[PDB]
Design a protein around this ligand. Sequence first.
Ligand SMILES: [N+][Cl-]
Ligand SMILES: [N+][Cl-]
Ligand SMILES: [Cl-]
Ligand SMILES: [Cl-]
Ligand code: NA
Ligand code: NA
Lengths: 121, 122, 122, 121
Amino acid sequence: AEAGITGTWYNQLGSTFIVTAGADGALTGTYESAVGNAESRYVLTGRYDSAPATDGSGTALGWTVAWKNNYRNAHSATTWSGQYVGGAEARINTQWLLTSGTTEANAWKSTLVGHDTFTKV
Amino acid sequence: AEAGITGTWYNQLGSTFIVTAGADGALTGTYESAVGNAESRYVLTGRYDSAPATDGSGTALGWTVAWKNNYRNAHSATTWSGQYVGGAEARINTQWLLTSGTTEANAWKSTLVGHDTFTKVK
Amino acid sequence: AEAGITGTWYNQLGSTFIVTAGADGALTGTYESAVGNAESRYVLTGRYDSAPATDGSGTALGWTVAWKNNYRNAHSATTWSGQYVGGAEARINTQWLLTSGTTEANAWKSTLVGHDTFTKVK
Amino acid sequence: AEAGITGTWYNQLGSTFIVTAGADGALTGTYESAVGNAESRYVLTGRYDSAPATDGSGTALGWTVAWKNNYRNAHSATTWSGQYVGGAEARINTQWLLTSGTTEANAWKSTLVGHDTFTKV
Ligand SMILES: [N+][Cl-]
Ligand SMILES: [N+][Cl-]
Ligand SMILES: [Cl-]
Ligand SMILES: [Cl-]
Ligand code: NA
Ligand code: NA
């Protein structure tokens, strides 16, 4: 739990996530995607449970990435919510929501949902 | 626009969201929830599009709150994903995911999903 | 209760839902959507709890509509999951998932999520 | 596409899904779970695109299971939305919503979301 979150992670699509977990619950780093209207790294900020477990539970966390950087602006943001599980093969299992900024007319179709699993391999 | 988002907002459950949108696309503030095993204010951090479209499109944003503060720890975290819509009655419409830490065994039932609409007070 | 669910309902987008709750927990009917690449009525099939709690709890139910009829085919399907709440103003509050057929490549962006509230007309 | 959906499928949790896909878009069969307040088989009903693709796309489908049978009544229902992909290893990739019937007070926490992948192995 805790510390172990810090590092570089990868998901099934090939995106790379580099985070630093601060002693008091903060998550900071950058996200470089593999899919979408994304081009380079984007900043990410999140929060995690700095005091999880002690039944074998994972550490709840979440983070956001607005898809705007110096090269692209997709006018969308993705939030990932999930939990970290350490061990010989640590992983972060997540479900995410991607909302695009639409006009009212298209508001009903503004959010996509998916799931991503990150490993350090 | 940072300015339109900065403020105090409330949702249909009676929770309070105090946020500051920074120039670099950052969102920081505190959240006071009306439901859950929550007690006091919790810190929030998020991001938004500081350069949205010039179209009456909303401004996409998102934020996270881990439900642990000096008084309580619920071992869970919620992320809200949605868009800010300004005008005379500005709203932030979101969909959220609340994940609880669990054992591998109960992981299938670790995430709740819902939706909240926030109204700005000013 | 089958009876309270049977009827014509409308949601905030202007779509029509005509359903019949059968005694065995089945839901059949048609859906007329206001949005999407939809044209005419589409068939729906679902299930509900024919024996809910005796608690002012809602009655859980869910249904599916594949967006293909004799006039149009959108290669997508939506499932709504929610509960029926009876009273003077009966509502069915749902959360939905709309999945489109895609190539492995775009599969990550194949599902949309939202929420609809239906009001019964009678 | 089409036909290939008919059969017995299994997901990662061990639940078994037995469906029949009808020529015009119907899905009928039974679901026997591995998790929850479930006990035996439950009836399922759904719909699928009987005319998908012709770019290599999967077949969109969805189905519902109300968790009430002659032995248990969990006062909940689950809907799975996803697409079928055939081939040497056919699979159905889904995201699901599980709603329990609550009082208004707990309505905010009535729906769980997850994802399941079914294979015939
Ligand atoms: N999403 Cl990645
Ligand atoms: N859920 Cl299976
Ligand atoms: Cl809240
Ligand atoms: Cl609709
Ligand atoms: Na809340
Ligand atoms: Na609709």
